[PDB]
C-alpha cells in the first residue's frame, strides 16, 4: 500500500476574552463601572 498511513489531526484555536466597559468624560468621580463598610471616610 503506497498510502502506508494517513494521520488525522484536529486543531482548535483558543477563545478571546472580552468585556463591556463604560466611559464618560463629563461626570461623577467614578467614571464608568462594569455591567457598605464605608471605612473610606474614617481616615478623614
Amino acid at each position: 500500500q503506497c498510502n502506508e498511513d494517513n494521520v488525522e489531526r484536529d486543531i482548535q484555536t483558543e477563545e478571546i476574552e472580552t468585556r463591556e466597559v463604560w466611559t464618560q468624560h463629563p461626570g461623577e468621580s467614578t467614571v464608568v463601572s462594569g455591567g457598605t463598610s464605608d471605612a473610606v471616610v474614617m481616615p478623614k
Binding site: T36, S37, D38, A39, V41, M42
Partner: protein, 36 residues
C-alpha cells in the same frame, strides 16, 4: 472602680476629639459585620 466620669481632670479639644473618635470608630466596627 473605673472612674469613667474622669472628674478630677480637664481638657477641651482632647475630650471633644475623643468623643468624636469614639462614635466614628464604634460605628465602623459594627459595619465590619464580622461573623467572629
Amino acid at each position: 472602680i473605673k472612674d469613667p466620669a474622669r472628674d478630677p481632670q480637664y481638657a477641651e479639644n482632647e475630650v471633644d476629639e475623643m468623643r468624636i473618635q469614639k462614635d466614628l470608630e464604634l460605628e465602623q466596627y459594627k459595619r465590619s459585620s464580622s461573623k467572629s
